[PDB]
Amino acid sequence: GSSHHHMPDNTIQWDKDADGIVTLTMDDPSGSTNVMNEAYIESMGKAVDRLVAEKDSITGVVVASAKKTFFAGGDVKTMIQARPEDAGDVFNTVETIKRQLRTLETLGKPVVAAINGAALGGGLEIALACHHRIAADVKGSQLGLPEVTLGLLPGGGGVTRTVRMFGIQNAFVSVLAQGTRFKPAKAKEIGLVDELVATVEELVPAAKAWIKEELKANPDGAGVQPWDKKGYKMPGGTPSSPGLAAILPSFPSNLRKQLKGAPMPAPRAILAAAVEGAQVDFDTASRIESRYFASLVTGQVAKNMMQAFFFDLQAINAGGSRPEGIGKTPIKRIGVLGAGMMGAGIAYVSAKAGYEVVLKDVSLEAAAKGKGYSEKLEAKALERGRTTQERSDALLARITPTADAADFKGVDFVIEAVFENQELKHKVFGEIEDIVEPNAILGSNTSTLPITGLATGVKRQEDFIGIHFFSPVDKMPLVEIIKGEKTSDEALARVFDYTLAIGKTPIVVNDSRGFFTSRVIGTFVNEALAMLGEGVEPASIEQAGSQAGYPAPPLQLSDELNLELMHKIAVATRKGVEDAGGTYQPHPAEAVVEKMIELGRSGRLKGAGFYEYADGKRSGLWPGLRETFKSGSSQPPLQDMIDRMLFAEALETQKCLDEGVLTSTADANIGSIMGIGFPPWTGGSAQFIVGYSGPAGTGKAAFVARARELAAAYGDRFLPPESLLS
Amino acid sequence: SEEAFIYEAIRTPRGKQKNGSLHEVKPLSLVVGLIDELRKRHPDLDENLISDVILGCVSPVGDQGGDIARAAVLASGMPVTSGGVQLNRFCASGLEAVNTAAQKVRSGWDDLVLAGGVESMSRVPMGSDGGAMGLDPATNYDVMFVPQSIGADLIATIEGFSREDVDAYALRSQQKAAEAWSGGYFAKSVVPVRDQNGLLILDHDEHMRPDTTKEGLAKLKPAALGGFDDVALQKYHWVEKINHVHTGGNSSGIVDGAALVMIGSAAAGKLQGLTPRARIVATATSGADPVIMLTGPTPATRKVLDRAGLTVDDIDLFELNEAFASVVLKFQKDLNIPDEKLNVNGGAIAMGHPLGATGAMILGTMVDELERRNARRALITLCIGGGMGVATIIERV
Amino acid sequence: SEEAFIYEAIRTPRGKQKNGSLHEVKPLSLVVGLIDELRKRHPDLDENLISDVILGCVSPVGDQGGDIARAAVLASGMPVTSGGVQLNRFCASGLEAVNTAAQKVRSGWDDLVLAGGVESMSRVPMGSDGGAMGLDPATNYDVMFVPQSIGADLIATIEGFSREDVDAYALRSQQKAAEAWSGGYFAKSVVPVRDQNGLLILDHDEHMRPDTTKEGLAKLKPALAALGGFDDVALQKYHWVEKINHVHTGGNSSGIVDGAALVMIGSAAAGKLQGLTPRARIVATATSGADPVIMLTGPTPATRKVLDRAGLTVDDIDLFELNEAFASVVLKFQKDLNIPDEKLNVNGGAIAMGHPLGATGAMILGTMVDELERRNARRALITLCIGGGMGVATIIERV
Numbered sequence A: 001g002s003s004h005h006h007m008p009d010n011t012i013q014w015d016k017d018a019d020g021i022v023t024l025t026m027d028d029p030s031g032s033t034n035v036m037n038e039a040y041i042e043s044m045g046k047a048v049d050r051l052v053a054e055k056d057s058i059t060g061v062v063v064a065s066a067k068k069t070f071f072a073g074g075d076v077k078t079m080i081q082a083r084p085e086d087a088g089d090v091f092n093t094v095e096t097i098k099r100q101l102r103t104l105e106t107l108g109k110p111v112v113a114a115i116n117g118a119a120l121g122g123g124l125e126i127a128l129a130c131h132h133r134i135a136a137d138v139k140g141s142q143l144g145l146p147e148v149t150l151g152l153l154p155g156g157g158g159v160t161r162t163v164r165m166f167g168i169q170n171a172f173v174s175v176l177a178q179g180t181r182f183k184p185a186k187a188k189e190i191g192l193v194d195e196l197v198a199t200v201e202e203l204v205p206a207a208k209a210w211i212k213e214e215l216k217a218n219p220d221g222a223g224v225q226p227w228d229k230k231g232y233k234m235p236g237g238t239p240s241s242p243g244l245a246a247i248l249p250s251f252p253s254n255l256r257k258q259l260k261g262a263p264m265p266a267p268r269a270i271l272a273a274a275v276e277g278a279q280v281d282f283d284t285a286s287r288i289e290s291r292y293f294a295s296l297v298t299g300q301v302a303k304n305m306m307q308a309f310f311f312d313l314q315a316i317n318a319g320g321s322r323p324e325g326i327g328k329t330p331i332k333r334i335g336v337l338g339a340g341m342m343g344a345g346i347a348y349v350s351a352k353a354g355y356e357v358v359l360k361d362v363s364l365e366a367a368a369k370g371k372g373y374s375e376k377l378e379a380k381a382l383e384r385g386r387t388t389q390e391r392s393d394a395l396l397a398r399i400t401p402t403a404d405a406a407d408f409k410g411v412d413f414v415i416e417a418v419f420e421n422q423e424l425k426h427k428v429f430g431e432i433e434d435i436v437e438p439n440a441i442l443g444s445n446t447s448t449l450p451i452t453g454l455a456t457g458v459k460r461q462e463d464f465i466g467i468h469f470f471s472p473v474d475k476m477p478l479v480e481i482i483k484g485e486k487t488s489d490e491a492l493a494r495v496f497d498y499t500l501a502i503g504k505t506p507i508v509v510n511d512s513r514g515f516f517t518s519r520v521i522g523t524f525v526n527e528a529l530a531m532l533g534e535g536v537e538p539a540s541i542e543q544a545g546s547q548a549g550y551p552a553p554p555l556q557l558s559d560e561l562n563l564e565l566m567h568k569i570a571v572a573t574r575k576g577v578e579d580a581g582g583t584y585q586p587h588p589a590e591a592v593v594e595k596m597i598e599l600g601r602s603g604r605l606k607g608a609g610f611y612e613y614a615d616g617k618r619s620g621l622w623p624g625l626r627e628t629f630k631s632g633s634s635q636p637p638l639q640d641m642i643d644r645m646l647f648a649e650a651l652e653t654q655k656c657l658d659e660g661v662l663t664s665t666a667d668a669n670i671g672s673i674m675g676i677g678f679p680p681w682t683g684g685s686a687q688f689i690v691g692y693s694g695p696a697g698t699g700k701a702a703f704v705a706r707a708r709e710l711a712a713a714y715g716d717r718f719l720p721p722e723s724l725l726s
Numbered sequence B: 001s002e003e004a005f006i007y008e009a010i011r012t013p014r015g016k017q018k019n020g021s022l023h024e025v026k027p028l029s030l031v032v033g034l035i036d037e038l039r040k041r042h043p044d045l046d047e048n049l050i051s052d053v054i055l056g057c058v059s060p061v062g063d064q065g066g067d068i069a070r071a072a073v074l075a076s077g078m079p080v081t082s083g084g085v086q087l088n089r090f091c092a093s094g095l096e097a098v099n100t101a102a103q104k105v106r107s108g109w110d111d112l113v114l115a116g117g118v119e120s121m122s123r124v125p126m127g128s129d130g131g132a133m134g135l136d137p138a139t140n141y142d143v144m145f146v147p148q149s150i151g152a153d154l155i156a157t158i159e160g161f162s163r164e165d166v167d168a169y170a171l172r173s174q175q176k177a178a179e180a181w182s183g184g185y186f187a188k189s190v191v192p193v194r195d196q197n198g199l200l201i202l203d204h205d206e207h208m209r210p211d212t213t214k215e216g217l218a219k220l221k222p223a224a225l226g227g228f229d230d231v232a233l234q235k236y237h238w239v240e241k242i243n244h245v246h247t248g249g250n251s252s253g254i255v256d257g258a259a260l261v262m263i264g265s266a267a268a269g270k271l272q273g274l275t276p277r278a279r280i281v282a283t284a285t286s287g288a289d290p291v292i293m294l295t296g297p298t299p300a301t302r303k304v305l306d307r308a309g310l311t312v313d314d315i316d317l318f319e320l321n322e323a324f325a326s327v328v329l330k331f332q333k334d335l336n337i338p339d340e341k342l343n344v345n346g347g348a349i350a351m352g353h354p355l356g357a358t359g360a361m362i363l364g365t366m367v368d369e370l371e372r373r374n375a376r377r378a379l380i381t382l383c384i385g386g387g388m389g390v391a392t393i394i395e396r397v
Numbered sequence C: 001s002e003e004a005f006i007y008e009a010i011r012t013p014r015g016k017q018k019n020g021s022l023h024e025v026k027p028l029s030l031v032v033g034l035i036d037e038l039r040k041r042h043p044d045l046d047e048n049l050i051s052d053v054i055l056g057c058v059s060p061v062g063d064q065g066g067d068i069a070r071a072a073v074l075a076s077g078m079p080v081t082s083g084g085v086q087l088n089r090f091c092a093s094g095l096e097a098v099n100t101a102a103q104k105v106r107s108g109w110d111d112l113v114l115a116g117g118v119e120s121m122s123r124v125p126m127g128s129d130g131g132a133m134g135l136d137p138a139t140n141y142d143v144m145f146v147p148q149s150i151g152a153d154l155i156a157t158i159e160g161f162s163r164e165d166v167d168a169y170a171l172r173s174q175q176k177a178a179e180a181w182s183g184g185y186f187a188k189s190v191v192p193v194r195d196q197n198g199l200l201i202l203d204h205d206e207h208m209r210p211d212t213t214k215e216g217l218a219k220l221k222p223a224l225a226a227l228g229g230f231d232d233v234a235l236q237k238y239h240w241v242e243k244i245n246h247v248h249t250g251g252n253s254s255g256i257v258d259g260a261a262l263v264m265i266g267s268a269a270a271g272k273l274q275g276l277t278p279r280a281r282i283v284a285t286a287t288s289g290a291d292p293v294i295m296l297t298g299p300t301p302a303t304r305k306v307l308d309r310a311g312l313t314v315d316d317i318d319l320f321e322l323n324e325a326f327a328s329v330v331l332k333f334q335k336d337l338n339i340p341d342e343k344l345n346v347n348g349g350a351i352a353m354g355h356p357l358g359a360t361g362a363m364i365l366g367t368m369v370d371e372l373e374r375r376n377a378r379r380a381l382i383t384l385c386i387g388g389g390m391g392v393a394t395i396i397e398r399v
């Protein structure tokens, strides 16, 4: 029947006081965080059955947590295993969950949520079912509905309630569509939290003080949400309201514009569940939300994203690629060589974590310009209120611009970011290796040159290692750690810990030309340029890139990588195997690169690439492009263009896994998503294979069958390797 | 195979949107006014023999809700057996009502049918009825909904129609409509609208700007909700940027108006002393992509020609609704229509586009121009929202 | 000229108005659901040969506005050339779309057409479109507007149908609809509604009360009305009548429900080319009506005109299907043409299963196509009354 139940250890402690205020303290003994799992559903079922059973002796309810966090997340381990035939169980689970919260919400008495810490996803949904929300303004505390980042949606009433609280437009844009996490002050200002306190010890007292005052002042409206009152007026109007109905058709198009046409069905479903829910009563609305939730969980994109942004990301942060047994070594002073975009961005993220940074260049005028990158970054942060004047002054005070190698004294962590040249890097390291501390990490920020070669320019080769950042350093989240064949496991762990300290994500890569990220993004760029030489419209190439889910279209990306540098890579990779005895099969893009260089259009730095660059900004494609490459003479299907770029990267990633470049698919997925911007809906260039979906089917077999369909039409570089064959 | 004939085809003047003369007139009153005129022209007509009244209406809400065709039959005092049905096929609702009336006559089960349309866009603006393709984010997101204005600009971008090209056609329409009005071409077809006292409310098409110059058209400024431009280019991915050439001066006007057409068999016409004016030779319905929206008239015209066993050379007059200038130019370019055969009395850019009635208005416009020129054939066609298209060929009797 | 054939006729179950299972289902989804069932039954059908899709919808507002027929074409991924037009002739819109589709085929300028209706009265109540009559007191005052319920009470008053007479008909409709559901008569026509995951939402006409009793019906209280004035207005026209006997309640009138229906109508050349089997044939259609104040005695002349047009008489018809908008309307129609009682609404009607305005005409049409096939009989006659004083009737012949 219609029940609050769907063996497990109880997760809720019950306490009724003299006044009649029942305090539900959630404390899952199977982990450090309260999680919406089977144990929670069963326990909240018992507790809500008890609140209804003892209704005559209960005047109010206080929901609290005994953990550092309030409540954060759900059963991803179960949600990822749900097959399309399991949609009935998934639908009935969220229906059972919401039936518990809806009973709590309609008990006829006030319920207050004591938010002592993080209230994320299902945690905020529990609090949103309460009539009053009191949050402790502690450090590390967050509130939000981040289900969309795992390809799901807030299915425990989050979508229905935030729409009833803020209206369709504000709830979707501010809360739902992006899964934004708010600090407790932002939460109070936008309405997610009602009031704040400074310590968790005041929470339950303040909650019972509010329950007592609410009953005394507002007895008839106690325990009644705004949408359960006669004459409830939804903010911004309902879809039948003529004010909202005028702009409502533009919501799917604005969403389609922001997503650039990429296949992301979670935001499409959230928007549908919000609007469809605002057209009916609350109960009918939440059941609609449950159907869209079940529709996402049983889908592949959710499984792609649950694998990457939950399981793979936790496997990485737990140290899956960190050498076993090695302990922690402190970092006292960081020495950055070079004040370019990389060196300046590196100096910022390092000093932002709290490290003392020495920023050396060839001139003081140059190093001061490098620190200016941090000053201009903190300037934007101050006027937008994301930092205080005090911490901003302290941050910049940790960056010491210099031009002498003597100021590298006391540096136990070196990050070189000078020009890409082996004998230049040998010289820069040669004159600082003796000034720095004897256990100092000697790191190079190189994109292509092998670490084993650069390491021979120092004596302590066991402490030489590649630390590959990505520009802009302040916003790109990955650090590619390259392990030369003389690099020690201690140096690996030390760089690994530093990466987490600056708030970035590490992947460990064995030494090889192109490493992982440069090698793979090369195949993405080369597929686009090959299509240009084949006579495909330049506008269609960029459309394919954006609709595939890429953050920046490939031709635009090519203009920023400098085609001159792009040509030098191919010259350096041919004599890397032709001088070695093997063979080098030239890519069709090399003829396109050489012709663009022939016409003096090497990229954006030059001032002209595939796009026109006027007044610092990018103003449309070069009109001579269509005449130069006979554009329009080849009009393949857009899905073929998309699959050519996705498969080329997915196959080069598998090549890297078979050669021992990467040692885990978790590094492959996160490294491709955060390093080079592989579309998040794929779950990574490795998850893309085991979760491919098209006309053929779903799985590894459908990928291979499709890769062979591409090999027949566009060349044998799409032929699947033996490792994927079964 | 009973043949369908047009015995009468009349319409109201088209009152403009802002400070329009027809804003105080209910849409129901516009239709009853035309019905009362048909009685004045044939008082001997036995209204009992009228089987049905088929009115097109794109926004059937408010003053236009509740089966406005039936409201006209009761308010005008027509026999209660005379039916009354409202249909909506967007901009072609006026012509679909005519075509359906002819198909009802050809089937031999309806004898004498009133068809037409009514649209008071000043009182009931378009989009007032709601709709799934716009107000439901699941289907809107899938069908790539784009306003008709942007599809018109995308057409001008693909075909290379400049701002001067479309504005040139706009001037052409303003001049040809001014000539037809001064020449007296619309004398017997435009029934002036009067109030309950017989006082004049409107006797001409207000929206016309007969003193239009290409300098004034070039001054105008070129859907503003954002997002739709990137949605259109996501489908038409070979286009880099949409050239926005369409303004208020080279697009159809927003007006109020209504039209009526009397359609029946030759036996029904003989029985009621009615002289047939023209014959419905053939009809057709096709469509094209709904993201560009307005390219559906080209295959529907190609179809109605093959059905009637005719070609472009067999047609004396082409009448395509001037929803947007690039739509007519693209149409003229594809079928290689002579310039002197196309919208010879102006169109919606000068006189207006009263959605539910336009198909019946330009149908009545052609019946008169064939009898005036002593020509034989006319082809009428309209573009439709959602990517449809309807076409009709009439022969003079 | 061309003969029109019914190749398929299906309908959704009719969901009730209060706490109904279909209240969460958008009206567009009911129609698309039926299109996806027609695809399942004929997978290799060339959808490009479908030249139009005509849907009846009395309240084209909100979820049902913007030409919902066109929406169903685009939403279901049908060819963009397949048209899509909404019409409204009040209660007979669904049958009018079927007849229009048949006439479009008979003219020869149409090969294969989808027709039907849709109405979600739980989401879009009747009168949501307003109306050129309500928002205009000058016209309302002159046409002497009277809602459908009072015309039915007046009909029962004039013809002498008592409260027990109309409740006797309400009981037999609930019985026959229960027998039909038990016998499986609706097994292949009623297509259950499922969500985007495939979970069941509704598989039966949930407005039915199979345990209806004479005692339970007699206890109901009589029924735009419940306001004032309309009774006196009706008697100003029918001035020989002194008092209106209000006999109609919720138990003997049509229920408010959600539903949709689809009928595939085409020419013999269309069905032959696509390997489709004809099920019935549109013999004739007709339109007529009577006074708008009595409103509901319109199907009597429309039936005589379609019988006269088909060259048949009442004795030639094996099954009569008249919509049970009100019990007195059917008893009048039965009394007039002397319809044998066992040929009339033989599988129940709107009193038991509901009346989804725009879709009702196509539902009861598909009800007769299946019943002629089940009984192995030739001819049926489908007719509906209309608000404002109209009427529509159709005669079909089993093939």
Ligand SMILES: O=C(O)c1cc(S(=O)(=O)O)ccc1F
Pocket (backbone or CB within 6 Å): A072, A073, A074, A120, A121, A122, A145, A146, A147, A148, A149, A150, A309, A310
């Ligand atoms: O780390 C997590 O468990 C996690 C949880 C969510 S939630 O929205 O399901 O609470 C979203 C993203 C996450 F990464």
Ligand SMILES: O=C(O)c1cc(S(=O)(=O)O)ccc1F
Pocket (backbone or CB within 6 Å): A562, A564, A602, A605, A606, A607
């Ligand atoms: O103006 C130039 O010559 C110029 C050339 C390049 S290059 O990458 O082609 O070497 C880069 C920047 C420049 F400003």
